[PDB]
């Protein structure tokens, strides 16, 4: 009887750093996917495995929404089989992703004059990320063979970087808000359904 709370996920006022992306489990409701692509304001709206307009006729055991922020040039790393800083070290998509990727420019919001350095991203890791894996550790990376007995120092680096979001930035580096919707069917009754499933 209560519809899924997508409005409060996109219109939310606060977004997380990409290495600290937030996942919400959506269940037990009817999601009107149309209102997403009816809002033809997104710079990225790409769906894999599922047709966006026929989503309103679909049922799922669970939906998952992953929200974060990246610089626009890195947006293309939000895709299956992609390679780069974000894909390897921040947020990795499986090669069979059945879901949609939505992104829109939020320079007016998340670029504060003099910089908005709150939004971060990971720079190194001992191994590339598995699908849907989040890492927010802050152990000092060891690129050097010698053990990192130092929090900071030669061949021992702090593994996080800050996005210098400023209103005069390049668009490729302007901040963009990103939502990933994944559709999981489990061997249990479906809980999220489209309006047209009638």
């Amino acid at each position: 009887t209560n519809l899924c709370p997508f409005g409060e996920v996109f219109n939310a006022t606060r977004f997380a750093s990409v290495y600290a992306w937030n996942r919400k489990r959506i269940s037990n409701c009817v999601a009107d996917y149309s209102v997403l692509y009816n809002s033809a304001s997104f710079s990225t709206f790409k769906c894999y495995g599922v047709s966006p307009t026929k989503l309103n006729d679909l049922c799922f055991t669970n939906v998952y929404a992953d929200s974060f922020v990246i610089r626009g040039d890195e947006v293309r790393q939000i895709a299956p089989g992609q390679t780069g800083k974000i894909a390897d070290y921040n947020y990795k998509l499986p090669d069979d992703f059945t879901g949609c990727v939505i992104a829109w420019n939020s320079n007016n919001l998340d670029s504060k004059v003099g910089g908005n350095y709150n939004y971060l991203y990971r720079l190194f890791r001992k191994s590339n990320l598995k699908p849907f894996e989040r890492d927010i550790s802050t152990e000092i990376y060891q690129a050097g063979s010698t053990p990192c007995n130092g929090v900071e120092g030669f061949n021992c680096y702090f593994p996080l970087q800050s996005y210098g979001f400023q209103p005069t930035n390049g668009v490729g580096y302007q901040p963009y808000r990103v939502v990933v919707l994944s559709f999981e069917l489990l061997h249990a009754p479906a809980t999220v359904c489209g309006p047209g499933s009638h």
Partner: antibody
Amino acid sequence: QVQLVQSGAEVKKPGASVKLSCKASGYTFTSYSINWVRQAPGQGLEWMGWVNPSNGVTVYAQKFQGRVTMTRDTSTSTAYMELSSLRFEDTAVYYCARERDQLVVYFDHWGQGALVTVSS
Amino acid sequence: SYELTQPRSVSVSPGQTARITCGGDNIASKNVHWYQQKLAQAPVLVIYYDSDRPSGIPERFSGSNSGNTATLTISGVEAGDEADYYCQVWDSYSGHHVLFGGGTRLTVLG
């Protein structure tokens, strides 16, 4: 299913260091992270951090970092948390809890909590 | 940092329906969970993923979350349920924080 057995409620002087233990029973020890939450008397809950038994990754809160050290021991299936540079406002009940989900943080089981009081 | 808003205390006659709210800016974007801390004991999880109950929790417990509020509803409350209730969310937005609420002192005028 699962139990989290804590250590005794040690009680120490200001500026000292207190180390608490938490052993898990029943489940595969390294499958779930272990978090530590403290409670000031008559007040709310403060998240202190967590440690992953699988790899030894330790994550701390902004407030307690630089004083807290969380460690793991898989050969005994036991985690521990160490708090140094105690002040009076550290008088609290410290529980250990099991992180059921890593993406959506929420806690299955809780330790009975150990009472650490910092007075004169 | 961002923080959760809980009422001081809510009191109801036995058998009534107690409702404990949890306030946060677009708190629907994240998953909330509810823990019962009985009087002077270890807390225990009552509600998770905003609706689901652990196997063992009575069905009179029921959660919800939307807009700027998550609500815990206990129908047919008795004197036993009288305890403290804490709503907790994950907020990596604010520098890897496991955020709790201020608690609420449910009281039954037995």
